[PDB]
Design an enzyme around this catalytic site. Sequence first.
Site, PDB file in Angstrom:
ATOM      1  N   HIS A 149       0.649  -1.207  -0.020  1.00 52.09           N
ATOM      2  CA  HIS A 149       0.006   0.100   0.017  1.00 52.09           C
ATOM      3  C   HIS A 149       0.643   1.326  -0.092  1.00 52.09           C
ATOM      4  O   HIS A 149       0.257   2.142  -0.211  1.00 52.09           O
ATOM      5  CB  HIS A 149      -0.946  -0.100   1.368  1.00 52.09           C
ATOM      6  CG  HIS A 149      -0.646   0.544   2.380  1.00 52.09           C
ATOM      7  ND1 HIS A 149      -0.380  -0.212   3.552  1.00 52.09           N
ATOM      8  CD2 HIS A 149      -0.498   1.944   2.764  1.00 52.09           C
ATOM      9  CE1 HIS A 149      -0.146   0.446   4.505  1.00 52.09           C
ATOM     10  NE2 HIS A 149      -0.225   1.719   4.168  1.00 52.09           N
TER      11      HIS A 149
ATOM     12  N   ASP B 229      -0.701  -7.427   2.418  1.00 49.93           N
ATOM     13  CA  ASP B 229       0.049  -6.059   2.031  1.00 49.93           C
ATOM     14  C   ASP B 229       1.431  -6.306   2.027  1.00 49.93           C
ATOM     15  O   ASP B 229       2.140  -5.869   3.261  1.00 49.93           O
ATOM     16  CB  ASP B 229      -0.559  -5.267   3.397  1.00 49.93           C
ATOM     17  CG  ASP B 229      -0.405  -3.646   2.941  1.00 49.93           C
ATOM     18  OD1 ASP B 229      -0.118  -3.560   1.855  1.00 49.93           O
ATOM     19  OD2 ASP B 229      -0.375  -2.968   3.930  1.00 49.93           O
TER      20      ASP B 229
ATOM     21  N   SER C 282       3.819   2.523   8.190  1.00 50.56           N
ATOM     22  CA  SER C 282       3.773   1.546   7.195  1.00 50.56           C
ATOM     23  C   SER C 282       5.137   1.161   6.364  1.00 50.56           C
ATOM     24  O   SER C 282       5.912   1.956   5.912  1.00 50.56           O
ATOM     25  CB  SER C 282       2.789   1.668   5.853  1.00 50.56           C
ATOM     26  OG  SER C 282       1.563   1.454   6.500  1.00 50.56           O
TER      27      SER C 282
END
EC number: 3.4.21.5
Lengths: 5, 253, 33
Positions: free
Chosen positions: B43, B99, B199
Amino acid sequence: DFEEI
Amino acid sequence: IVEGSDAEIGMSPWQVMLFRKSPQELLCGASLISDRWVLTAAHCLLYPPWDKNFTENDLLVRIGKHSRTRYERNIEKISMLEKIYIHPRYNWRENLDRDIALMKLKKPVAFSDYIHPVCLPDRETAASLLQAGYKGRVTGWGNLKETWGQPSVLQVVNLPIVERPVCKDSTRIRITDNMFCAGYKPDEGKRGDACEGDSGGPFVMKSPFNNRWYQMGIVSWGEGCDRDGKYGFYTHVFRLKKWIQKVIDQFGE
Amino acid sequence: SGEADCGLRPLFEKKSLEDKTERELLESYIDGR
């Protein structure tokens, strides 16, 4: 913010 | 990172910074798995609902960093991506299922005291350490506050793995076997979490058997940062290991 | 399972120095090795 690259 | 601490020098030598060439900006964390491969959350590259779809082009990789902002004159190494590979069944449409993404550096990077690859777990390793209660370690240059700054230096937090049922009951979003959640229970009065901008960073554990650091998860998603009764969610690396073996063996170092 | 010399930090494992909070991880694996 960021410094020169 | 929320309720974390400054990293020590050389504490997380596999930490990688995903950097935007222009506007020059910090996109995400990542991790070094060899001198030509970087692991991150899919992502960070591709997310259509936010109109995000980055190319090899639009990017830079900064390795050996401590300071978030300053150019670390004889310590960091900046690289160019030769290629980007996303998990074919990465679900951006609903829950960030799978992810994960790999980045292959244009040219091999040299190891130093500040740059060193993290190991990928084997089946055995995964089995014995991926247990509710066991503590992992998360690093980033992300939000210090849900909303409130940005740290000067790499932050760190140690968080316990949480049993699946609790994970599942904390949200309305659909959890899958490729995710695991972590943090403290509100009663356990101890806090901390990863947060936006965190992230693609690594959730790592140190094996008590051979005392090597392994990457177990990838910082993926959450709801708010550090709220009671909520948990951080991470990509289950062991679980996507075959996919990883596969791209490396198919076109790599 | 990673690189080769993977997960051994030049400034910690490699010189036999422990980081200030690694011990917390180890004691949760109902105390390490």
